[PDB]
Symmetry: D2
Subunit: 142 residues, 4 copies
């Protein structure tokens, strides 16, 4: 049997880099800058989150499968997530907005923590599609 196909496919597949907002000044909102975490949304329906640790072994922090649900939401069927352990063996529904600039905004809701405490919190994330630049930088530290 087939999961529901009744959505307009979005360009979810890709390697995505987590971003954050950086300001030089205390009380002023920051501008978008890339960070150290990647989400691989594979062409064959698998999801992996992993984080670099400079000079050390990178680590997977979550993995599973994913499935688009509606024109602007998809689920991650998480097997294990060490960043967010209350999501283990559960579905997380992510609402998304993908811009032609390669920036994807995600948000998801979590009701309870692992100890059953009320949380009722929306999480918000900004991701940027990783691409191939025109030129191989001559001094790249591989």
């Amino acid at each position: 049997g087939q999961e529901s196909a009744e959505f307009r496919p979005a360009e979810l597949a890709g390697i995505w880099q987590l971003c954050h907002y950086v300001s030089e000044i205390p009380d002023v909102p920051g501008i978008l800058k890339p960070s150290n975490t990647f989400k691989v949304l594979s062409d064959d329906g698998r999801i992996v989150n992993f984080t670099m640790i400079p000079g050390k072994d990178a680590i997977i922090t979550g993995y599973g499968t994913y499935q688009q649900l509606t024109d602007n939401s998809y689920k991650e069927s998480i097997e294990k997530n060490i960043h967010l352990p209350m999501l283990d063996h559960k579905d997380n529904i992510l609402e998304f907005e993908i811009g032609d600039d390669g920036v994807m905004y995600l948000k998801y809701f979590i009701a309870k923590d692992l100890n059953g405490n009320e949380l009722n919190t929306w999480f918000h994330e900004t991701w940027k599609r990783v691409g191939m630049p025109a030129k191989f930088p001559e001094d790249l530290v591989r």
Copy 2:
């Protein structure tokens, strides 16, 4: 062939010593090879504080117990491999470290290169604990 567990995320490594003229010890670096279940390969390199970059992609397929092919579509690190097959010999240890070798005869301009390439890659895994101080 006996199917090897190639599919996964791999981190490039190098060897470091504090002194010259001695072998170094293995240390992870900034480049990743994503080998998907459906036979896609992507190499990308993190650049601290900047956008990561894809440096090659295509498809791949295991051929024998110690070799696989990358059918490269585009590779900006190794552009003589564009629309070519590269055959890689591989050995994967029980410690999750994979040693690759491959040979390239010519550069894109037809100059003789006749170079053997060696790469060490380590399988990226999920540790038991999320580190308290992690910079995501």
Copy 3:
């Protein structure tokens, strides 16, 4: 004036948030200001995996309880300050964080800039323990 403990090694900081339109929390970055006892100032920036670079130098002198001058010889980040004095207002907290402000009117080509600069710096210290996994 009451002499402030300016002499030392200072690390530039910035503010980070996971979401837009909110204030971020303080995080250290890659640039250092070395304020020597003999009144020399050097700014340099680490570039991961590459050679660090000096981006400015000169001399400095405390003027009042909350200001000091940098007499810049050369600054490739801020080249309108070459052979000029920059007056910085400073406040150093009990947590070792120093807040700097300064104002620059013109760029090197004479274009009006009239910009206030804010910098947050943190005093670099010696922790009680050398971390076991440190990458020197």
Copy 4:
């Protein structure tokens, strides 16, 4: 009173970056690459060693005063050294060679560890003088 001035002054003063040797291949010696540690040899006779920790607070690992002794040796009079605690409140004599290419080789001998165990080991280090490049890189992450 004055410490001995009977040496030909060398160009020790500077900010120095610790280097190591990197190879892509297991059993082959590496080439010189810069690492994350700095030694400030000040114009006014003070020494500080410190190490970056990417995304985190940098740390001082040793400090004191220094004094050239001979044409190719100097001492670090170490107050505290958390990298090498057997050097606390002691002099360490470093033999050096400074190249016109800005590379300095250092070596020093340590007899005993902090617990009094025999060590009798020569340490060897390679350092590179930090300089001001021609151009401010446009995309520098400060």
